[PDB]
Ligand binder design. Structure first.
Ligand SMILES: Nc1nc2c(c(=O)[nH]1)N[C@@H](/C(S)=C(/S)[C@H](O)COP(=O)(O)OP(=O)(O)OC[C@H]1O[C@@H](n3cnc4c(=O)[nH]c(N)nc43)[C@H](O)[C@@H]1O)C=N2
Ligand code: SF4
Ligand code: SF4
Ligand code: F3S
Ligand SMILES: [Mo+6]
Lengths: 1244, 224, 509
């Protein structure tokens, strides 16, 4: 009795202590069980997060009372070497809050359908027993189609059932494929590395039926085009553990603590090892808190600082006191010794294409691909074609390596870098300079559009009898940087204080960063690299990569690292971190995701061009190609709208198309037969004649736009969708907030490759299907919402660039309510499709266009120039001057059986990637035992793909990163090309086989694979380029070395053969709308930056109450105190940000750490929480992408040129966005447009 | 009338008393987590300093007065005759009652109309406070009736009844013969508060922290 | 002399990345209930700032902690026993919900149920978790000032800017910010325990964790004012107060606290500290507040000293606890390397959660600078965070111990750089700060590599001692409601018996 216990008052008094200050009591403490019993749980399950953060962290999911209650990080990762800190616990605040979603008020529990669409669907089924015909009756009726499309984003969702939605979806897919083409059906899903099988689910279904799989890396602008340009690689970087091996690190435009949270400790801890760190950000970012020095250059001007730093490095470590390490490094690993041909101009010369073996008399002894082999002079003045050039990769074997040998005599040779001291004469070469251009918001330095430099040259007698002047990339580079070499060049610097194209003094004016800082740090960085042989590193992110001229920002940093021999050395190099793009078991996953085990090829598409076209953002383009050309380029050869360049790129096989042709590709085979010729020849003839045209030429004719779109693992319409209002208008057909006029309304120049119509086609998408576990902004605007399983309710796998571990997502409990995993959702759709298509689609023949692929022999397309077959400049040769034209047989009724089984092509053809292939029969035999086999039907005897685990095991068993047996066969395949053994890289792990159930027990480190350039070793950390530098494997570039010189016609004419400073572009989105809809408050133009947020990963977690409570309770925008005060804006005041593209509403965060002139709305707060109506559009306030618009860059459209050839997510136009400017002002009327009668008014 | 008289003044007082005691014991042994003052101050500090202090200082003055006024035996007699006690009760008790009533009304206005407090209140909090406000008002209303008998004849009856009840002497109701009805009501509502006591926040009264005044500052609990 | 043990905690602010993961995990586990939804046992604040609750460090306003009277005796700033009781009807210093923030939620369901024909896109508006009413706007949150969110003049009201000419810090080039994660200090002389009229708050003898007994607490809400760190939160629903429980359910078996194991930056260290309970009052009542830091160090005992070891055993400290104390990272950082410092020692509570001050980028200068004593690495004099600010936060205004900690961290860096870059031994910086190579290497092992087994050295609380673990192991958790838990006397009105006890006594002795 607690009451009776009170009588033991005195008896429970123990000894007093501290001279009567304290009393020890001997009383009951049973109440303590109250908190003990809260901590107690049923079990813990290992799982992770399928979100694009790059974290890839393994968590303990706690189940209590049979429900998911909370999570804490696993700490059992295999420990790193004793001299390196371990990875545990990893994690971040966003991930710690995921458990909130499972039973939250925003959880999607049942399949939903727009009421208007349901009403018509059911009324249609009552008149049409066949669902395909029911869908037709609705979609072919302008009034009916419009009734549900205009209802998008306007409420009315009603509970449906899996049976109903699956039938409608299947029916719509069949109708679309049958009447318009399989490529009129598409799916958008990104970053497969965060949940491999989940991505594969939809991609596999789409690929089987011929639908288009949209890209994401380029679309999100995570792809740094400078990587493919410089290394012929999409993106390969050192692991975070490798930062610990560096002795000098610069965090440039990378907010490590905030955007690389679980890895940040490697950065803070390496400082204790004596490593110096420098932060380069315009604002006082979180990263600055962790560094030794904070440099704050004007945003967007970073390339200027990088150029100045490189200037100092070359001057002091390459010229004045030549570094033995650096000199040797650039001699063997760069294209600097390579020879460049000079083009005759009026009074001077321009740098032309690189000299090729084919340009000389006996082609230098090279009979194979002589036009694809670069040339240089050896130390004995003799001309030679060194091993490693892209020409040695195909058509021959054993010479595609970086051994310093003569490609003809196979003898050892030493390449010479500079011609200075052996030149026949000195010639003046003009270099493009843009540092004088720019908007009023950035400082400029006036010099001359063309800077003439004195270059040492040599005259050569070409094979065609003509003569030519040549110089090395090395000399061209030193001149470009403005280094005086004794030739008395007026445009070269006499000192660092000399304001010349590229000095510290010059950069100080452009960036605002003190010249002494630029000098001191460049020197320290280079000195460190010299002492340690390359252990200087630069961690770079979207701060620099999301600008229109991201390539210049990157090549600037890249050159610094190359000049100091840091690329390929542990503790040094280019450390690019953006999205989670590294799906390690690549070649094991690719066949699964794109049904390559059954049919080849699939239909990949680069999304930036796709949306620029279909959401009609090109109809509002303000940027012209002309204003981007080099001042030394023939303007008349580059006329047309930016989209015209894309259309031309497409027909030349440079970039993919989608839809591909203006005619249903399933009908071409029939016509070919009647014409008495095979489909391929028939298509080519039709293309030449114009009877069949690329769909890109007429995107608004009514048959050339996508009609069915699947969206999963993405919030396209609330996060990544640049030009939000354009997507709503043109893709959705709903109200929109576009403020400006299009080309037609302004009477501007219409494209010369694309048809034009004053009133663009709207509401192009017939059906929008979104899969999610929370009702996102995208779901809000969809026709059908499918409840998917959370990451704690399904099995899958996850890997990342940050660490070498592969671990799983696991179902802690069966999916709640009626949710299903993505794999099961698409499997069910594939099943319904298979029955609904009977009588409509059978064994069809599909004509598929495929762009010239990088890492395939075809990459050696156009060697010396650009020829457009449509212009009659050359013949239409698919796979060389045009895209490959492939024939694909599809068994539509067998879609489900194929989806659920591993196809016969793995055994008939084999597997491979990155230019190599191998036999994988043993793996298929193993899979038959692990997954069991089909008992009968179309896939009888084939391994099964019933569950997500079966799919995961397929990935693990086929990939070299997860199966030592495959790893050895992969390295063996590569060895054939290089002539050097590389199997020693995996022999010691040949018995290793990672299994799904083992990684559930403990994450497993992967195996060194030729798919990558770093090693998974216990003595050396993973470092990109390590294999190129230490195994002498060439970078997949024209020269085989790190390419400083981009000699492709377009690269030269757009002024980017060499890195140069390029100021932020003028989007011209503000001046036409500012002051046009005044609310009485002052308006001001500001740079609109969208760095990634702290209270979410993109838009995921944005609606999570924990993140909203720790943040500011909803959409907010950061403003400097000066700008806010100028505008009369107080902290937390409602403000509106807008321009020609649209408008957004949010609350202000006023801070001193934001420099005047810029505003930051962290990336992705989306459109579902705490947003009042807009005073500009009179609609719900928009989002950050309501004020952005897609503007492509021609240099990102280049294809059919070695390293500049296509690859899904490897190359293509990017969704840059930091150059944007917006009008900002305090809101007056705060109307919520919800009928609650709870609106406010902000006075003054 | 005589039936109701014996019920309310001879029977009801023991029902209320039994419930009060066993209810308090049972809630203390089986409901420690529910044994709290239930402060609502943090949710709305406005006016609480004045209101709560007036109410508590006032009601404590009343308690002291009622306690010694009705329980103190007449023999404890020459210095404090009944009519002197009555004057003390009317003036000292009256003043305390006014303080109490003002505080109580302010607290009730707050509980009912302050959004944060009203939204988080329990029905019992409203009921118990409303009854206290009414009881205090009834109490003050007896003063003009006591004033009609400054010789203490009325008080003698009430004290007689109270002492009979607490000493378990039957026939307690007979002491009330002739007392003004107002006193009748006050007594019944007062006993009713004792009945409801264990099922309301009033249990906080049992916990007046007297021992704190002589307790060592630091407390440490040994393994147990 | 009475030795007691406690698992202390040290947070390395130099490695804190201000991510708040620690705050989210604690919330999910311990405070997601209605009544404490606004309470963050562990919360992270960006400095400069006023914090959560707003201006909690302003004791003149909140009256937290202890004061040393003229006669040398200690008294809660709140008032002595009688003064405190006099404030019980309405605590005049009590922080209001607005001082924290009004907890909110959003009407997500409107996104799902919005009717067909809506004139505008539906949205989820905020609603109060206190009243259930629509909120026109969210105006406050527990981390409202995150990353210098707010005008400098507002953030600079920060109590720690006292005695500092702060104008220069309002200039862009001189901008600075740091993170201050904090939980309950589980003090040796807790002001909360001393200010609770019911005596419901107590410090556990075996591990020093301070708890608020949920049975005994009467909701007097005086303790909230007493705590100078404002780490006790009133549960507005239950009517009782709650606070960080130092995750005792985990500590009891030797596991790290949730916020410790889940700290992404790997900045939290857990280790035993042996202290002389008999010296607590003497130390806390030292005349000069700048002596409190050292006075507390003097209360900590050397775990490797056989005199201490034998006394500990005599006083009942388990062998495994003494062993853990001998390899305590907390003892090394606070007593040996002098890197860790108390949080606001001037409150006189003898806090047990200490901090290593943060380094920062060098300050703005006229030029790029020159090589200093540490070469290309910073010298303590060049750091941009004003040392006086850090001293106001950790050492009662005395910059000496702060400078020593920062200098030593930098010295370690200098020494390690010579080793790993130049491949040479350079003890110059270490010698200047009084560190040996061995100490610098151990510092490096614990601070840089920081293996899990080195960050957390938590012994068992030995729940089997002085108790009956056998019957408890067999019957704990069957919460059928025997109504016999929580009291030592066996008699109970419902005529029941404890489920986890043995009632049939052995008759064979
Ligand atoms: N918490 C969290 N983590 C995530 C994500 C998230 O949404 N939330 N998303 C992923 C993904 S997909 C990406 S692409 C990255 O996180 C982007 O982060 P990063 O730090 O590189 O970019 P960001 O665009 O934020 O830029 C980083 C900082 O650089 C500064 N900055 C901005 N503009 C510039 C500039 O022009 N020049 C320079 N030198 N710096 C500039 C700024 O401080 C910014 O925060 C990554 N992990
Ligand atoms: S969201 Fe990403 S970074 Fe955060 S805990 Fe999850 S996996 Fe790790
Ligand atoms: S988890 Fe660790 S690093 Fe992150 S805020 Fe908390 S204490 Fe700092
Ligand atoms: S004062 Fe004591 S009674 Fe409870 S509310 Fe605080 S622990
Ligand atoms: Mo990204």
């Amino acid at each position: 009795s607690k009451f009776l216990d009170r009588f033991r008052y005195f008896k429970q008094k123990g000894e007093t202590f501290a001279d009567g200050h304290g009393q020890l009591l001997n009383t009951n403490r049973d109440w303590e069980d109250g908190y003990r019993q809260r901590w107690q749980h049923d079990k813990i399950v290992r799982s992770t997060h399928g979100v694009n953060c790059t974290g890839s962290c393994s968590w303990k999911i706690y189940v209590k009372n049979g429900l998911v209650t909370w999570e804490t990080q696993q700490t059992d990762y295999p420990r790193t070497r004793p001299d390196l800190p371990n990875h545990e616990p990893r994690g971040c605040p966003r991930g710690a809050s995921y458990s909130w979603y499972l039973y939250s008020a925003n959880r999607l529990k049942y399949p939903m359908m727009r009421k208007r669409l349901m009403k018509m669907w059911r009324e249609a089924k009552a008149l049409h027993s066949d669902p395909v015909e029911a869908w037709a009756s609705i979609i072919e009726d302008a009034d009916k189609a419009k009734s549900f499309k205009q209802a998008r984003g306007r409420g009315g969702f009603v509970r449906s059932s899996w049976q109903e939605v699956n039938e409608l979806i299947a029916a719509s897919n069949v109708y679309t494929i049958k009447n318009y083409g399989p490529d009129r059906v598409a799916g958008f899903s990104p970053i497969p590395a965060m949940s491999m099988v989940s991505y594969a689910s939809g991609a596999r279904y789409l690929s089987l039926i011929g639908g288009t799989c949209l890209s994401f890396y380029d679309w999100y602008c995570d792809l740094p085009p400078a990587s493919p340009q410089t290394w012929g690689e999409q993106t390969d970087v050192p692991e975070s553990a490798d930062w610990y091996n560096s002795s000098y690190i610069i965090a440039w435009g990378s907010n490590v603590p905030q955007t690389r949270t679980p890895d940040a400790h490697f950065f803070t801890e390496v400082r204790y090892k004596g490593t110096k760190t420098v932060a380069v950000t315009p604002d006082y970012a979180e990263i600055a808190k962790l560094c030794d020095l904070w440099l704050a250059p004007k945003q967007g001007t970073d390339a200027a600082m990088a150029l100045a730093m490189g200037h100092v490095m070359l001057r002091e470590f390459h010229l004045d006191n030549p570094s033995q390490y650096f000199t040797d490094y650039v001699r063997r690993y760069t294209d600097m010794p390579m020879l460049v041909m000079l083009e005759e101009r009026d009074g001077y010369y321009a740098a032309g294409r690189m000299l090729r073996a084919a340009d000389l008399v006996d082609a230098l002894g090279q009979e194979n691909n002589p036009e694809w082999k670069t040339v240089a002079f050896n130390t004995n003045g003799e001309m030679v074609a060194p091993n490693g050039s892209i020409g040695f990769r195909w058509g021959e074997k054993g010479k595609w390596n970086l051994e310093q040998r003569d490609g003809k005599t196979g003898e050892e040779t030493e390449l010479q870098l500079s011609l200075l001291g052996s030149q026949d004469e000195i010639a003046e070469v003009g270099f493009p300079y843009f540092g004088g251009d720019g908007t009023e918001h950035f400082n400029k330095v006036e010099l001359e559009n063309v800077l003439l430099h004195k270059l040492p040259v040599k005259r050569l007698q070409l094979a065609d009898g003509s003569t030519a002047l040549v110089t090395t990339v090395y000399d061209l580079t030193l001149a470009n940087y403005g280094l005086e070499r004794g030739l008395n060049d007026v445009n070269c610097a006499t000192s660092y204080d000399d304001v010349k194209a590229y000095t510290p003094a010059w950069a100080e004016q452009i960036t605002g960063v003190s010249r002494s800082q630029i000098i001191r740090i460049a020197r320290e960085f280079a000195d460190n690299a010299d002492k340690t042989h390359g252990r200087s590193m630069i961690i770079v992110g979207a701060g620099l990569n999301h600008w229109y001229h991201l390539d210049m920002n990157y090549r600037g940093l890249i050159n610094m690292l190359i000049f100091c021999g840091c690329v390929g050395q542990s503790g040094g190099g280019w450390a690019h971190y953006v999205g989670q793009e590294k799906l390690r078991p690549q070649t094991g996953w690719q066949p699964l995701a794109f049904a390559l085990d059954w049919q080849r090829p699939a239909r990949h598409m680069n999304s930036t061009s796709y949306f620029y076209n279909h959401s009609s953002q090109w109809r509002y383009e303000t940027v012209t190609a002309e204003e981007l050309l080099s001042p030394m380029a023939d303007k008349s050869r580059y006329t047309g709208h930016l989209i015209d360049f894309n259309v031309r790129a497409e027909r030349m096989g440079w970039l993919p198309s989608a839809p591909q042709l203006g005619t249903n590709p399933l009908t071409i085979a029939g016509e070919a037969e009647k014409a008495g010729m095979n489909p391929v020849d028939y298509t080519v003839k039709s293309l030449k004649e114009g009877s069949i045209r690329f769909a890109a030429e007429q995107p608004e004719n009514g048959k050339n736009h996508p009609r069915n779109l699947f969206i999963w693992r993405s919030n396209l319409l609330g996060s990544s969708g640049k030009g939000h209002e354009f997507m709503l208008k043109y893709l959705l057909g709903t109200e929109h907030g576009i403020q400006g006029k299009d080309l037609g309304q302004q009477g501007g120049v219409k494209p010369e490759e694309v048809d034009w119509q004053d009133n663009g086609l709207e509401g192009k998408l017939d059906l929008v299907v979104t899969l999610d576990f929370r009702l996102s902004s995208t779901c809000l605007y969809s026709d059908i919402i499918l409840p998917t399983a959370t990451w704690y309710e399904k099995d899958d796998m996850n890997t990342s660039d940050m660490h070498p571990f592969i671990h799983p997502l696991s179902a802690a409990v069966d999916p709640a309510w009626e949710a299903k995993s993505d794999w099961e959702i698409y499997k069910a759709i594939a099943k319904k499709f298979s029955e609904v298509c009977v009588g409509h689609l059978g064994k069809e023949t599909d004509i598929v266009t495929l762009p010239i692929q990088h890492d395939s022999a075809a990459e050696l397309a156009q060697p010396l120039d650009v020829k457009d077959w449509k212009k009659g400049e050359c013949d239409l040769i698919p796979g060389k001057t045009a895209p490959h034209i492939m024939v694909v047989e599809r068994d539509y009724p067998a879609t489900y059986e194929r989806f659920t089984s591993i196809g016969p092509l793995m055994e008939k053809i084999g597997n491979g990637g990155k230019g190599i292939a191998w036999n994988t029969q043993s793996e298929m035999d193993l899979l038959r035992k692990l997954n069991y086999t089909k008992a009968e039907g179309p896939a009888k005897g084939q391994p099964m793909l019933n569950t997500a685990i079966d799919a995961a095991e397929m990935i693990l068993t086929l990939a070299p990163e997860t199966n030592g047996q495959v790893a050895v066969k992969a390295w063996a395949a590569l060895s054939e090309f290089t002539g050097r053994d590389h199997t020693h890289l995996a022999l010691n792990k040949e018995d290793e086989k990672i299994r799904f159930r083992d990684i559930q027990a403990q994450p497993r480190k992967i195996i060194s694979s030729p798919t990558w350039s770093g090693l998974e070793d216990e003595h050396v950390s993973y470092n990109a380029g390590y294999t190129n530098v230490h195994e002498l494997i060439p970078w997949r570039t024209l020269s085989g070395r790190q390419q400083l010189y981009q000699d492709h016609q377009w690269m030269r004419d757009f002024g980017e053969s060499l890195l140069v400073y390029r100021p932020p572009i003028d989007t011209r989105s503000v001046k036409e709308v500012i002051g046009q809809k005044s609310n009485g408050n002052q308006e001001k133009a500001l740079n609109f930056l969208t760095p990634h947020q702290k209270w979410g990963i993109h838009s995921t977690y944005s609606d999570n109450l924990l993140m909203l409570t720790l943040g500011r309770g909803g959409p907010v925008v950061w403003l400097s105190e000066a700008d806010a005060k100028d505008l009369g804006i107080a902290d937390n005041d409602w403000i509106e940000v807008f321009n020609s593209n649209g408008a957004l509403t949010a609350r202000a965060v006023v801070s001193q750490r934001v420099p005047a002139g810029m505003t930051m709305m962290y990336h992705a707060q989306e459109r579902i929480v705490n947003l009042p109506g807009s005073e500009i559009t009179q609609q719900r306030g928009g989002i950050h992408n309501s004020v952005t618009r897609i503007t492509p860059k021609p240099t990102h459209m280049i294809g059919g040129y070695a390293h500049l050839a296509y690859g899904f997510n490897y190359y293509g136009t990017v969704g840059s966005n930091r150059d944007e400017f917006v009008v900002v002002r305090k809101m007056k009327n705060i109307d919520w447009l919800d009928g609650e009668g709870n609106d406010q008014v902000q006075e003054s | 009338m005589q039936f109701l008289n014996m019920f309310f003044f001879d029977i009801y007082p023991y029902i209320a008393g039994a419930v009060f005691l066993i209810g308090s014991w049972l809630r203390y042994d089986y409901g420690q987590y529910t044994w709290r003052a239930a402060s609502s101050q943090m949710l709305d500090r406005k006016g609480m300093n004045l209101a709560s202090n007036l109410f508590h200082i006032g009601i404590l003055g009343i308690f002291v007065g009622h306690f010694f006024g009705m329980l103190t035996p007449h023999w404890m007699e020459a210095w404090l005759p009944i009519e002197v006690k009555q004057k003390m009760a009317m003036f000292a008790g009256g003043a305390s009652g006014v303080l109490c009533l003002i505080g109580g009304v302010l607290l009730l206005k707050r509980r009912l109309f302050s959004p944060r407090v009203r939204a988080t209140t329990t029905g019992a909090d409203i009921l118990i406070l409303s009854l206290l406000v009414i009881q205090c008002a009834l109490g003050l209303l007896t003063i003009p009736f006591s004033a009609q008998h400054m010789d203490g004849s009325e008080m003698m009856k009430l004290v007689g009844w109270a002492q009979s009840v607490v000493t378990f002497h039957g026939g307690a109701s007979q002491h009330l013969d002739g007392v003004a009805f107002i006193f009748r009501l006050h007594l019944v509502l007062g006993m009713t508060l004792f009945l409801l006591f264990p099922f309301s926040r009033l249990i906080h009264i049992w916990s007046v922290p007297v021992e704190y005044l002589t307790r060592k500052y630091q407390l440490v609990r040994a393994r147990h | 002399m009475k030795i007691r043990s406690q698992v202390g905690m040290v947070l390395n602010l130099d490695k804190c990345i201000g991510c708040h993961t620690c705050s989210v995990t604690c919330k999910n586990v311990w405070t997601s209930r209605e009544g404490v939804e606004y309470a963050w046992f562990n919360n992270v604040e960006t400095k400069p700032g006023q914090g959560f609750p707003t201006d909690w460090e302003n004791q003149e306003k909140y009256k937290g902690g202890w004061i040393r009277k003229i006669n040398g005796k200690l008294q809660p700033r709140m008032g002595n026993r009688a003064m405190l009781l006099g404030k019980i009807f309405a605590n005049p210093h009590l922080p209001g919900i607005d001082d924290y923030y009004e907890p909110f939620d959003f009407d997500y369901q409107n996104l799902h149920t919005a009717p067909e024909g809506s004139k505008s896109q539906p949205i989820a508006r905020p609603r109060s978790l206190i009243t259930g009413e629509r909120m026109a706007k969210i105006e406050k949150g527990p981390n409202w000032e995150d990353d210098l969110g707010g005008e400098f003049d507002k953030l600079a009201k920060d109590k720690n800017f006292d005695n500092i000419q702060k104008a220069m810090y309002s200039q862009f080039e001189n901008t600075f910010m740091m993170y201050l994660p904090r939980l309950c200090e589980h003090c040796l002389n807790p002001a909360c325990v001393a200010t609770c009229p019911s005596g419901a708050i107590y410090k556990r003898e075996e591990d020093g964790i301070v708890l608020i007994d949920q049975d005994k607490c009467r909701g007097w809400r005086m303790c909230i004012t007493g705590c100078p760190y404002k780490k006790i939160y009133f549960n507005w629903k239950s009517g009782k107060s709650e606070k960080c429980i130092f995750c005792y359910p985990r500590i009891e078996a030797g596991q790290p606290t949730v916020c410790s194991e889940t700290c992404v930056g790997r900045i939290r260290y857990l280790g035993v500290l042996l202290y002389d309970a008999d010296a607590i009052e003497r130390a806390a009542s030292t005349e000069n507040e700048k002596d409190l830091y050292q006075r507390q160090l003097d209360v900590f005992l050397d775990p490797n000293d056989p005199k201490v070891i034998e006394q500990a055993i005599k006083d009942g400290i388990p062998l495994s606890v003494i062993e853990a104390a001998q390899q305590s990272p907390v003892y090394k950082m606070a007593m040996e390397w002098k890197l860790a410092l108390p949080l606001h020692p001037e409150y006189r509570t003898l806090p047990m959660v200490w901090y290593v001050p943060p380094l920062s980028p060098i300050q703005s200068a006229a030029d790029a600078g020159e090589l200093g004593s540490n070469g290309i690495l910073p010298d303590v004099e060049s750091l941009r965070i004003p040392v006086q600010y850090l001293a106001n936060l950790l050492t009662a205004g005395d910059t000496k111990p702060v400078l020593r900690a920062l200098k030593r961290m930098l010295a370690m860096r200098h020494y390690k750089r010579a080793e790993t870059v130049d491949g040479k031994v350079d003890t110059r910086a270490l010698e200047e700060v009084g560190l040996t190579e061995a100490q610098a290497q151990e510092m490096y092992r614990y601070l840089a590599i920081a293996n899990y087994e080195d960050r957390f050295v938590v012994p068992s609380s030995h729940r089997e001692l002085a108790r009956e673990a056998f019957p408890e192991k067999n019957g704990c958790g069957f919460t059928f409601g025997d109504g016999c838990h929580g009291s030592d006397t066996k008699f109970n009105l419902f005529n029941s018996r404890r489920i986890d006890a043995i009632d049939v006594t052995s008759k064979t002795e």
